[PDB]
Write a protein that binds this ligand. Structure first.
Ligand SMILES: CN(C)c1nc(=O)c2c([nH]1)N([C@@H]1O[C@H](COP(=O)(O)OP(=O)(O)O)[C@@H](O)[C@H]1O)CN2C
Lengths: 13, 180
């Protein structure tokens, strides 16, 4: 599994 | 290094066209498997709320066609979220983007194998955001997916969401409703 929470997805944007 | 996603996802777009067949309006926009490529797509494509009536976006696992007939969806169903016509300017894009992040970021725990993809239908009578799963009889798994969806999108109890088989004599009741 590879899991990204919303906070992380954001900082990539 | 781009951050790899657990799997490949394809974005599809359907433009409403009363001229041609449904299946011919469906175009695969791109396939991606990193967070960075997801954003490059999302940042440059039109907001859901901006679409013309009858248009849809689909985000499905690569190799799953976003149709009822596909072997991955044939025995499946969807959690359906109706977006009030009046509240769509504040909820439509938020709901859609939160659902995309929840799916690509694998936020559905040990149930991620059951998720096929997400759909937004932009309509005059009211928009719909849906999450498609592969097995309509897996009640425990489906309920759980729904609880997480509700949470991610912050859908209040005043606005039930329902899980139904993909649509003879009788109107089919939903299998699950939250709040029940
Ligand atoms: C294989 N095949 C033809 C076929 N296979 C399909 O998989 C498929 C269709 N046709 N779809 C067409 O769009 C209408 C649903 O729109 P909607 O869900 O936006 O709901 P409304 O337009 O709001 O009533 C359906 O009535 C159907 O005409 C949709 N769809 C998924």
């Amino acid at each position: 599994r590879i899991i990204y929470d919303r906070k992380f997805l954001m900082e990539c944007r | 290094m781009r951050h790899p996603l657990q799997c490949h996802w394809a974005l599809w777009y359907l433009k409403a066209d009363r001229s041609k067949d449904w299946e011919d309006c469906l175009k695969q926009v791109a396939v991606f498997d990193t967070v960075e490529d997801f954003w490059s797509l999302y940042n440059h494509i039109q907001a859901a709320s901006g679409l013309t009536w009858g248009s849809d976006y689909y985000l499905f696992k690569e190799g799953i066609k976003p149709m009822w007939e596909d072997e991955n969806n044939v025995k499946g169903g969807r959690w359906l979220v109706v977006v009030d016509k009046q509240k769509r300017a504040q909820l439509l894009d938020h709901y859609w983007l939160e659902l995309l992040m929840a799916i690509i970021g694998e936020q559905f725990e040990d149930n991620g194998e059951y998720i096929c993809g997400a759909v937004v239908n932009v309509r005059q009578k009211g928009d719909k955001v849906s999450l498609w799963t592969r097995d309509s009889l897996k009640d425990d798994v489906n309920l759980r997916i729904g609880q997480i969806l509700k949470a991610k999108l912050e859908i209040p109890d005043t606005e039930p969401i329902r899980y139904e088989v993909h649509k003879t004599g009788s109107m089919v009741k939903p299998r699950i409703v939250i709040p029940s």
